């Protein structure tokens, strides 16, 4: 059958996909910039398809409801046929692999801690052993699910606190979490992926930092629906771009070449 | 059809697979220890198969001859039907993906520099700009192929020197390379994967070290022949073990918990 424009789901998450300053006078894919916008263009070229970037309707990564088994976020879009591919900082997880396919990873990450500078916290164990400083994670993402299922005493203890914390310690978007750290006088710390932590650490006002080692070792993959023709070509594209140096170049472009903190 | 014992190809490469001290009085899989021996046991359990570890006959990772298109090493064993799966520090590369399947990566690495302590070399550029200190790579592996195809001025310059260097700067095994660094009075440096470099840095006599940043960002994958039933189960096994913490535990076990250099 004839080639058709591929519907790409992605998420507004800096510096992966961001609105261009002048987006109001732009159309289509041209409205957007970032690592994943650059990566989509390269994947598309190698795979030989035309594509339309579409921001995920519900603004979520993807979680399955325990009772209903319904998926939301970008994972849901793939599962229910509203997108052909997800090119986003979407973490490869076993439960997600039940319902979608992931490419080999194009970027590594692990769960990490973001503090406001000066906060007397160096580690997850530190957080777990006190109550003065609140802490949380993003809703409907892999970090929250990590804590929910972890067996580890410290993380299990963190999860027991976070799940019942009031007011809620969970946030709707990464930017909300970062804003919360910045304005809570060191009484909130944020659990988020090292990639996003390390990005924000080099953004003005330069008042946050990453502390501790990463809690785990994971990757982002390009996701396609089960049985999609596209998966094979996508996986070869990722390997090619890795070997060409493109993944390294794009990481440096969007994290460090553009860093605002000296 | 009935389950059959799975023939696993692997390679004697420390600390992935090593002979046990008392191997002469042991049989079968019990002759061996290391990261990949531990990983094979876990993969097998999750995938529900019985297996036989078999050291690759020609002692090589895998390279394709330019003229004949024949494959050697573990890749060859999979290609020609002499093994069902490779569980080894086998690097995921696009050319290898032509003829075998790789799982998602279970360990990260990049090409790095090993020096004898005291050698006035901090980087690949350093090596490229002088002739007093010789340098090389392992034959029939991904590091040599990296230099052979690289476009980068420094690496292209390194490749031009290495390919014509006399006496040969290439080595038959990693241990030969390490031994060569140790006994060449700082006049040989060795290009090898960060994983193996970082292992040897914590081995007596503690006379080597890693210098510079990694030249690339790659991973090891479990490899199966094209069309193997096993690939799907293997990929889910890797994701499960990642999420359980097993990959982190085994890395720490074989690299750092056992370090000999304080
Ligand atoms: C540039 C890059 C390439 C690859 C990865 C991560 C990265 S990284 O952006 O996470 N990179 C930045 C520089 N170093 C910190 C290494 C990690 S990855 O480990 O997830 N996957 C690799 C290979 C792609 C096929 C599987 C392994 C490419
Ligand atoms: C423990 C570990 C787990 C995984 C990787 C690497 C590693 S690591 O041994 O290379 N690890 C050691 C500790 N840190 C240095 C992070 C890297 S990986 O990036 O190659 N692959 C991940 C996920 C497995 C599915 C794809 C991503 C698991
Ligand atoms: N990368 C995560 C979202 C961020 C997070 O959970 O910290 C995901 O795919 O769910
Ligand atoms: N891991 C490499 C071997 C070691 C090297 O080339 O440095 C491979 O699969 O070829």
The residue among A238, A229, A230, A206 whose CA lies nearest residue A43 is A238
φ and ψ at residue B87, rounded to 5 degrees: -120, 100
Residue pair A78/A224 in contact by the 8 Å Cβ criterion: yes
Residue nearest to atom 3 of ligand 4 (CA): B141
Local structure of residue A250 (DSSP, 8 states): H
How far separated are the first and last CA of chain A, in Å rounded? 52
- Asked whether A239 lines ligand 1 (CB < 6 A), one says yes
From chain A, the residues in CB contact with B219 under 8 A are: 104-105
φ and ψ at residue A5, rounded to 5 degrees: -60, 130
User: Bridge-partner residues for B111, per DSSP?
Assistant: B193
Resolution in A: 1.5
d(CA B204, CA A231): 46
Residue A193, annotated as binding a ligand: yes
Which of A242, A249, A251, A255 is the best residue to mutate to test the B interface, defined by the most B CB atoms within 10 Å of its own CB?
A: A242
- Asked whether A144 lines ligand 1 (CB < 6 A), one says no
Token look-up 């035309």 returns A50
CA distances from A257 to A111, A250, B125 (A): 23, 10, 21
- Category of A133 on φ-ψ map: left (φ > 0), alpha (ψ -120 to 50) or beta: beta
From chain A, the residues in CB contact with B243 under 8 A are: 93-94
Tokens linked to A61: 């990564």
Is there a contact between B219 and A94 if contact means CB atoms under 8 Å apart? no
CA distances from A90 to A44, A74, A75, A154, A239 (A): 18, 8, 9, 25, 18
d(CA A140, CA A151): 20
Residue A24 buriedness (CB in 10 A; 0-12 / 13-18 / 19+): exposed
Residue pair A43/A237 in contact by the 8 Å Cβ criterion: yes
Residue pair A217/B248 in contact by the 8 Å Cβ criterion: yes
Q: How far is A239 from chain B (nearest CA, A)?
A: 6
Respond yes or no on whether the N-terminal peptide bond of residue A167 is cis (omega within 30° of 0).
yes
Give the residue range(s) of CATH 3.40.190.10 domains in chain A: 4-109+219-258, 110-218
- Asked whether A60 lines ligand 2 (CB < 6 A), one says no
d(CA B177, CA B192): 9
Residue pair A181/A190 in contact by the 8 Å Cβ criterion: yes
- Asked whether A235 lines ligand 1 (CB < 6 A), one says no
Residue nearest to atom 16 of ligand 2 (CA): A217
By Cβ distance, the residue of B92, B217, B239 closest to A247 is: B217
Query: Ligand 2 atom closest to Cα of B109?
Result: 10
d(CA A105, CA A238): 8
Residue pair A89/A71 in contact by the 8 Å Cβ criterion: no
Respond yes or no on whether the N-terminal peptide bond of residue A250 is cis (omega within 30° of 0).
no
The residue among A49, A55, A51, A45 whose CA lies nearest residue A23 is A55
d(CA B192, CA A120): 40
Q: How far is B100 from chain A (nearest CA, A)?
A: 13
From chain A, the residues in CB contact with B223 under 8 A are: none
φ and ψ at residue B138, rounded to 5 degrees: -70, 140
Q: How far is A232 from chain B (nearest CA, A)?
A: 11
Q: How was this structure determined?
A: X-ray
Residues of A with CB under 8 A from a CB of B: 92-94, 97, 102, 104-105, 108, 152, 216-219, 221, 235-236, 239-240, 242-243, 245, 247-248
Residue pair B197/B123 in contact by the 8 Å Cβ criterion: no
User: Kind and range of the H or E element at B199?
Assistant: helix B194-200
φ and ψ at residue B256, rounded to 5 degrees: -110, -40
From chain B, the residues in CB contact with A239 under 8 A are: 92-94, 97
* Ligand number with the minimum distance to the CA of B250: 2
* Superfamily of segment(s) A110-218: Periplasmic binding protein-like II (3.40.190.10)
Separation of CA A174 and ligand 4 centre (Å)? 38
CATH class given for the domain over A4-109+219-258: alpha beta
- Asked whether B90 lines ligand 4 (CB < 6 A), one says yes
- The count of other CB atoms within 10 Å of the CB of residue B133 is 17
């Amino acid at each position: 059958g004839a080639n058709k424009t591929v519907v790409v789901t992605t998420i507004l998450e800096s510096p992966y996909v961001m609105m261009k300053k002048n987006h109001e006078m732009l159309e289509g894919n041209e409205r957007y910039e970032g690592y994943c916008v650059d990566l989509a263009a390269e994947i598309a070229k190698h795979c030989g398809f035309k594509y339309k970037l579409t921001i995920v309707g519900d603004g979520k990564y993807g979680a399955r409801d325990a009772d209903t088994k319904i998926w939301n976020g970008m994972v849901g879009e793939l599962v229910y046929g509203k997108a052909d591919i997800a090119i986003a900082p979407l973490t490869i997880t076993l439960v997600r692999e039940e319902v979608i396919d992931f490419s080999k990873p194009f970027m590594s990450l692990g769960i990490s801690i973001m503090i406001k500078k000066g906060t007397p916290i160096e580690s997850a164990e530190d957080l777990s052993k006190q109550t003065e400083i609140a802490y949380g994670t993003l809703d409907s993402g892999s970090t929250k699910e990590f804590f929910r299922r972890s067996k580890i005493a410290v993380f299990d203890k963190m999860w027991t606190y976070m799940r019942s914390a009031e007011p809620s310690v969970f946030v709707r978007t990464t930017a909300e979490g970062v804003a919360r750290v910045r304005k809570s006088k060191g009484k909130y710390a944020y659990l988020l992926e090292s990639t996003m932590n390390e990005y924000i650490e080099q953004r003005k006002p330069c008042d946050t930092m990453k502390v501790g080692g990463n809690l785990d070792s994971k990757g982002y993959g390009i996701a396609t629906p089960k049985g999609s023709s596209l998966g094979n070509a996508v996986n070869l594209a990722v390997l090619k771009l890795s070997e060409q140096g493109l993944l390294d170049k794009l990481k440096n472009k969007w994290w460090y070449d553009k860093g605002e903190c000296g």
